[PDB]
Amino acid sequence: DKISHKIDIPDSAWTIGIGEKFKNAGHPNVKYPMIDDSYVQGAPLGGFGAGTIGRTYNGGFSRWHLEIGKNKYTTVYANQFSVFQKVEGNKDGVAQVLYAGEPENGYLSSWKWDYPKESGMYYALYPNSWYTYTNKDLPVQLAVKQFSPIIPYNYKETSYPVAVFKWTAYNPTNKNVDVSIMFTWQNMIGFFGKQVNVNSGNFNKIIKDKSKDSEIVAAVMGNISNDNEEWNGEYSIGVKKVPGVDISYKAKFVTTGDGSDLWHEFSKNGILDNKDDETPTKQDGIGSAIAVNFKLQPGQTIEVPFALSWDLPIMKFGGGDKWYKMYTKYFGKNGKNSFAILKEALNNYQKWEKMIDDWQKPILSNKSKPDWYKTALFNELYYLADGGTAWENGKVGEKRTNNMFGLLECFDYNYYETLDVRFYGSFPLVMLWPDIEKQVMRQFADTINVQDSSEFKVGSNGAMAVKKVQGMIPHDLGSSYALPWIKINAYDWQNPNIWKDLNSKYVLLVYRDYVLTGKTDKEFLKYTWKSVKTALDKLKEMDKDNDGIPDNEGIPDQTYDTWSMKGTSAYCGSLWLAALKAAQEIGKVLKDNEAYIKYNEWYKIAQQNFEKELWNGEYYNFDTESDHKDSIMADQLAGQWYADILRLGDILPKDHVQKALKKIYEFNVMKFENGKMGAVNGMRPDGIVDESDIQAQEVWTGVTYALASFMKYRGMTEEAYNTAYGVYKMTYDKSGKGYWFRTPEAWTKDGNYRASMYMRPLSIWSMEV
Numbered sequence: 001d002k003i004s005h006k007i008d009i010p011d012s013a014w015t016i017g018i019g020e021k022f023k024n025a026g027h028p029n030v031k032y033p034m035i036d037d038s039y040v041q042g043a044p045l046g047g048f049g050a051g052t053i054g055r056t057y058n059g060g061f062s063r064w065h066l067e068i069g070k071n072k073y074t075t076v077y078a079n080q081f082s083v084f085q086k087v088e089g090n091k092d093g094v095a096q097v098l099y100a101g102e103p104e105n106g107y108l109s110s111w112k113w114d115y116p117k118e119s120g121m122y123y124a125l126y127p128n129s130w131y132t133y134t135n136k137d138l139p140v141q142l143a144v145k146q147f148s149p150i151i152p153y154n155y156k157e158t159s160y161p162v163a164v165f166k167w168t169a170y171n172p173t174n175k176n177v178d179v180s181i182m183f184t185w186q187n188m189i190g191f192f193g194k195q196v197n198v199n200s201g202n203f204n205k206i207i208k209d210k211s212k213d214s215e216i217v218a219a220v221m222g223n224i225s226n227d228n229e230e231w232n233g234e235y236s237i238g239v240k241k242v243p244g245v246d247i248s249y250k251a252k253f254v255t256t257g258d259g260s261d262l263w264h265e266f267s268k269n270g271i272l273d274n275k276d277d278e279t280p281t282k283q284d285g286i287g288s289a290i291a292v293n294f295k296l297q298p299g300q301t302i303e304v305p306f307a308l309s310w311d312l313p314i315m316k317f318g319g320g321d322k323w324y325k326m327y328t329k330y331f332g333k334n335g336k337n338s339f340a341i342l343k344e345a346l347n348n349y350q351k352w353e354k355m356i357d358d359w360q361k362p363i364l365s366n367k368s369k370p371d372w373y374k375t376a377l378f379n380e381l382y383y384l385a386d387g388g389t390a391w392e393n394g395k396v397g398e399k400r401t402n403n404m405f406g407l408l409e410c411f412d413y414n415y416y417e418t419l420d421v422r423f424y425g426s427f428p429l430v431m432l433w434p435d436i437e438k439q440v441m442r443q444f445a446d447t448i449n450v451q452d453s454s455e456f457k458v459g460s461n462g463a464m465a466v467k468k469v470q471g472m473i474p475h476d477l478g479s480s481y482a483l484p485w486i487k488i489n490a491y492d493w494q495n496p497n498i499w500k501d502l503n504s505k506y507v508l509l510v511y512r513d514y515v516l517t518g519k520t521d522k523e524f525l526k527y528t529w530k531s532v533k534t535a536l537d538k539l540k541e542m543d544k545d546n547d548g549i550p551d552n553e554g555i556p557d558q559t560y561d562t563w564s565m566k567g568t569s570a571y572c573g574s575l576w577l578a579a580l581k582a583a584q585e586i587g588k589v590l591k592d593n594e595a596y597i598k599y600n601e602w603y604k605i606a607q608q609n610f611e612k613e614l615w616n617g618e619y620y621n622f623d624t625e626s627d628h629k630d631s632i633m634a635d636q637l638a639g640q641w642y643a644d645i646l647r648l649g650d651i652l653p654k655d656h657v658q659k660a661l662k663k664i665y666e667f668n669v670m671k672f673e674n675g676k677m678g679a680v681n682g683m684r685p686d687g688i689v690d691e692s693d694i695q696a697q698e699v700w701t702g703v704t705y706a707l708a709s710f711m712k713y714r715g716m717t718e719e720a721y722n723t724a725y726g727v728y729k730m731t732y733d734k735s736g737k738g739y740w741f742r743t744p745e746a747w748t749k750d751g752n753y754r755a756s757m758y759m760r761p762l763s764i765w766s767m768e769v
């Protein structure tokens, strides 16, 4: 490996061998079918709301999130990089697809598949990833850096449906070597969204953009139809000429044949026929190819950029609504702009790389932080792009000031912006894209007084309940299978209109977003104030026994939606205390004296009773009335965690908080599989896991990172990082369960999981407040 030093991969990149088998992989631990796409994953490509494409560590374009809100794992075999090399003085060269696998059927049988093991590495530090190719039969070593311009405080390039592939090639040998790199791509119009005739009308064209000191050559893969539908648009691949390289192309090869129409050309001398052909297809799948060819002398290096774009301007949800995607603001809505997007990337990728370096540098250059922590911090962000992210620029056939946004809870539980989860998972948005975060919160503010008296069947017990009650914050802003932003509360396992955490979490999120954006946005506080007061006043009505605290009803009436709470719980009770303190402060800022006094009075009463009811001398009891009310809950002081972040001071005595956190570390972490797997949710005082519900026996990745944050800002530094390390280990390490780029909600002690690709572990960014 002499290519590593010609490129700059950070030491904190996650790494794996190309073609590496992983033996320890976890699987779902639930009864009903659950997504399990295997451990063959990678960092995704694509901006926010663009649809993303997961290219795996084996090189395949395999995890397709282009249909917004859906996860489709299938390798499109035509989509590849391939290499040809010939040593000067030899009769024949060698050609190889850079994919550690082969097709399942006979399509593309002529291509050279099965890139060998032990011949290259994959590296990832989101939004960047890299492949190195160090193969004994390829004298010239290659590497590629691939990325999309995901940039904090940037709402433009961050939205783009584009990826850059910056290749580096180096000849360490003493002979001249002829080298070609070829990008192939299937015309994927009709891959989703088209009910019949899926390839019909697909056609490919070549664009040659020649200016001074510039040549880009690109294939545009589209359809003859000008229909404005979800399935229609264009894909483009292309390359920018650099000194010392020639470009060749093939506009049309058949993907549903043996591939030899293309491969016979490439495998001979690495040079394609330059045959244009715009003839549309009927049944056959078609693709395009763009190649570069160059000669490397001994010791010579060359860099060449390729790119990929996709202009699919319309997203459609299962309820019928069609929206334009955010990037259309910048490139247009007609679905004929893939070349413009590609050209922007090819002409500006060097600036984008520097912008990414500029935002990663503060963390990467802090040598007090271990590299494993940096691996997790950056790579967990894959979810902001990969979480079915929807970001609208208008409803089809209708202009407003804002662009509504939503991130899925996950794909198995297909709900946008689940609020009890975003309480944990929204940290990267407030920290790094605060204009999105505030937009999401204003969306919630607007729903507070919505009433929908239609009824749904509650899944957990079969009872009928009202869909949306006035004054109760919704669980979610809909499902991609139905109508995101329009039909809220798609969740039906429990009735969220009686949850005891949603209204308080809402208030806490509002105040968080003011505090973490500099305490300057009074306008955001003004927009949300009525909803905040309404939320607290409605939750106060759920105090059945006049202790000043909402009562859990002996059912799962909060985020732990199979774990029953009864009476005053540490979790919902501490959230309530913190939300009251936050509202007091907002009242002061907005000069609403009567709100300040009222919430101050509720706070003093609730605080005294919480302490009396739950403090046991060592920690806060789980609750006041449950069968295992003395269980040690990992999240028992969630309200105090948030109060620390919001700078609201002590809601509970410092001594008791410290005692409680030390107990959690000593028990829920250290007596759970040696502290190597995170904090288990519930532990009995005798040091064995609480078995009253599956959720008590689970480690929640997002809860655990949040607890690590809580510990860190309370000065328990070793405990904080040791607690977080188990999550990192299980997710990324060789000794883990193979969850890289699909961090789940939960695992049990056997390491098996529930709900891969989950929003909650984005809470790791609360460790960087």
Ligand SMILES: OC[C@H]1NC[C@H](O)[C@@H](O)[C@@H]1O
Pocket: 409, 413, 415, 418, 420, 421, 491, 558, 559, 560, 561, 745
């Ligand atoms: O895993 C628990 C999780 N299930 C799915 C629900 O949408 C969410 O509110 C809850 O926290």
Ligand SMILES: [Ca+2]
Pocket: 542, 543, 544, 545, 546, 547, 548, 549, 550, 551, 568
């Ligand atoms: Ca009460």
